[PDB]
Amino acid sequence: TLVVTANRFEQPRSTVLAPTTVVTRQDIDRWQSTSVNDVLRRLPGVDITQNGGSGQLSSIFIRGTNASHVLVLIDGVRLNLAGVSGSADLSQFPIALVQRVEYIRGPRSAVYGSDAIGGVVNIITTRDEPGTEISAGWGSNSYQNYDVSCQQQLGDKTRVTLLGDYAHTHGGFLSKTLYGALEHNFTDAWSGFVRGYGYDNRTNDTRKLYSQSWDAGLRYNGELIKSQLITSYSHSKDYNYATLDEMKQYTVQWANNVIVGHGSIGAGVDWQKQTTTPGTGYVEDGYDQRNTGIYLTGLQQVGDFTFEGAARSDDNSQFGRHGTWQTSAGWEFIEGYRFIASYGTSYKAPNLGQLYGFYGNPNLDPEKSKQWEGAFEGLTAGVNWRISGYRNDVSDLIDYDDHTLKYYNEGKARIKGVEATANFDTGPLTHTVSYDYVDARNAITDTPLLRRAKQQVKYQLDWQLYDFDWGITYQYLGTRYDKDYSSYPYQTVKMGGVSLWDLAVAYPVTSHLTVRGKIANLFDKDYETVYGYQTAGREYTLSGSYTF
Template sequence: MQLRHSLLACLLAGTTVSAQAQEIIITASKVEASREETGSAVSIIDAEHLENNQITLVTEALREVPGLAVSRTGGIGSTTQIRIRGAEANQTLVLIDGVEVNDNSTVAEFNFADLLSLDIERVEVLRGAQSAIWGSDAVGGVINIITKQGKGPLNGSVTFATGSYNTNQQSFTLKGGDDEYNLALSGSLLDSDGISAASSDRGNSEKDGYSNSTLNFKGGMQATDNLELNLVLRHVDAFQETDKSDFNTGTIIDDDSHAERQQNSGRVSAKLDLMDGDWQQEIGYAVTKSRTESFSSTFNSDALGKKRKLDYQSNYFIHTDAAEHRLTFVAEREDEDFDYSSTYSTVKQSTDSTGLVAEYGLNLDETYYFTVAGRRDLNDRFSDTDTYRFSFAAWLNDDWRLHTSRGTGIKNPTLFELFGSTSTFTSNPDLKPEKNTTTDLGLEYHFSDIDGYIDVTLFDTDVEDLISTNATTATNQAGTSDIKGLELTATLNPTDRLRLTASYTYNDATDADDQQLIRRATHIAGLNASQLLANGKTRISGGLQYNGKQYDTVFALSGNRRVTLDSYTLANLAVTHAYSDNVEIFAKVNNLFDEDYEEVYGFGTEGINFTVGIKLSGSL
């Protein structure tokens, strides 16, 4: 097994990865800018990478991003968490087309299990504390998913795929646009018999199925020469069969439990350009409604969370001969509702907050870039808080770029943490927000003879007042958690046919007692290569993902205990062939070497599995 891994690693290392010149991001400052202008650590996954590697779930690609740790409790559709630089899963803010989609019906984290790679233009991953721009939830970073906008004559596609575990998916896209209007509609139906959520290595054999229906709409119109109107809508309906924990032994065992998840979100916005574009104003209103119904033989629950957000942003640009200045002001009003009922209890609560942001940006001679931002959050349940962030980037010469940032993060206790979900839960009015401070420093080398770069970034984070929740109450942990490490990224594109990306993360994440935090491996690495063959129609893409040894906690009545999860390496291989201008066939093999591994203690993982399919596309 190790020999095969080494051979594939050598094969991929001998190839090269993709770099996108002037990659555009908006997450760092809510204003479009190239990646090279950004002092913060950011990674971009583009549509080409998703399509070349036949990505079904976005988490498959996120595993390749430095600083990210992914944990899934079973097969496809099982609860999936992402931790950025050792932060908790609910300390990552997730946006889809500008809408915050963290699920506040539970602990305000986003369940990546239901996020399909459906007509996505790019995924931006911003690492480090970003609360000064994005508020609560952005303690560890921000993941921003942007779907494709309609362009050109009306066109569409349909995709049919089938594979292991009786997994089937049917998807469609419909897009078009001109200078006045644009629209994009996409949808997908996915269902799978799945595997046993409880590990089969421990004698469990009952398969736990999953189904997902997703529908996206994105449209806009140019109402006048300087007024743009936009609307995005998203609906997700998922059904997941699950297994249960045996608290006598702390293991996961077969069970007929299941959960139904639904999320509806949308945003309407208007953007006004004045003074020849030097003064931009945008106002938007977004709504997210998340619902999770859980059923078992002994316990049923219904959790409903709603979030409504009104925001206004103003950008003012000042141009001089040597410099460009930007002044940004943001005002936000957010209201949240939490409505929970179960076999044993009922909880109904709400909260609201107001955020005010001011940011200054400087572009000096296209060589030095500086931003500084401050935010004031006014809360109805907690003390008002202030956060800040600054970033700096500089071209030292034509090849070397320096970038650094420092920021603070704040994570307000969720309504779930404050009031719990059982009749025995004791509210804690003294529960304080979690907070952190993150500093990173990176050096990037750009190759002069090929399109690509290598980046090395050091980071250090101090976390205070981490919230710990059990069946009876929630409390703030004493002391400071220390997280520090290194991120290495290589992005190269030596020819028009050859792409390669590589990443490595060293993450030393310890709590106040100097114990490594659970589900955060010290070493994580990834390689991906994609080669278009000489016929110009066939592309072969392959990847390796290494996850080092990590720890987990087993919860049992006899007492909790700490366990070690072994390291593992996963390989995948994808082939696409353009049969004609309108027909593409594809195949993919995951876990190519049938690695036996465990991401979360007691839960199963998929063995070697495959997908084959066909995509039909064309103008209408």
């Protein structure tokens, strides 16, 4: 029920007018996900493509938007792995760290700045759940996982969290994760934290990625006033063999929010520096980019109406000043039913390669989105449902000009989509269903954009019988257009749609020991999300956790 992703501070989801999805760790353990993509692919509006199995490059297409038009936050801060390519790829991010996901669709540059065009995915790594745990798993393709985790009180008012994880999967991918946290309450209103973690990955032509992130902050959580001051530093090193991509990202943010009337008003200032090593991302020199943004947010309930807003101004060391804004109005016209209307602008900053690489244009402006969305939400006969339509006009897309061998702002895209979701129970069965239609086109030429499913259906059915907890996952991935690079001029090819099924079980052997089982791709269906790149096939997994 609570989220922080909408305006940075806690609020109930019912008061967030944008469609909103929350995934908890209970969900991730039940689903038996061995990657971040597997979690995300289940959610509304998400279309993930991957050059094969785990560890391989991937892209996230939220609601038809480009790969680079989703904002991935880790504990509220822009994902470091995204900064060199300017495009979020979570294949290397360790699933072991994911305690919660809050995923908000629709624009949100008016709070977060760059990249929040299709939506915002915030991966949270914090848990409140004392104790010690050991866990492990084996599966198909010699998959193997071991994991030790711990959270305990060091006296009154201070807690410590530790975790280590080893994951390995042949064709392949090797991941080692370490994470520690200290949380401290100076009073019941004032809190502080220091966090550090990092991970060492190898992917097979070989890839050796290493990242470490450190975060530190103060929060004030009062009856009316809420405040946060947060510091983050990330250092990544990305070897392909040989080529080295290295980036340091520093972040400081100060936000406040106060409860006023039946809602709130907030403001903050957001500063970001990114330094890259020479040769990073096929750019010759090392670069230092800086961004500052100041934004305002507000929520109010009057009568049957809810109004939500945000507005931001970003000053970028390369393109200068760009402003964004968004509003939503919602009207509960009969109890349990609501009509919601939203408008929002957002942007994407140019990336290092586009700006300074062999074909760079140092004068590029940001890509700009205007979105309109309308929705009906309802609770009918024990069924919670919602249906939205949205229109997204993207312009000044950064395209390569083949005649002058330089990038320019010129492209246009028009995306018209529909999202429909419902959840409900039938006796002991729980159903979670969504449907997405996404008509994403080049607006000059009126031709469909490549790499995106026009349609997806997603169905989750959970139930408990003896003490077995069962979960079935269904996905239809619709027809998709891609290019075939095996032959030049590269031809556009049509990839047929596919139905995919998973089956997962959990059993508490004792009150301390849970054993779990999964068959991913129950019908050994052969398919690609990227033309040429074979996906998994039926895989089996068998795992356990021991708590004390």
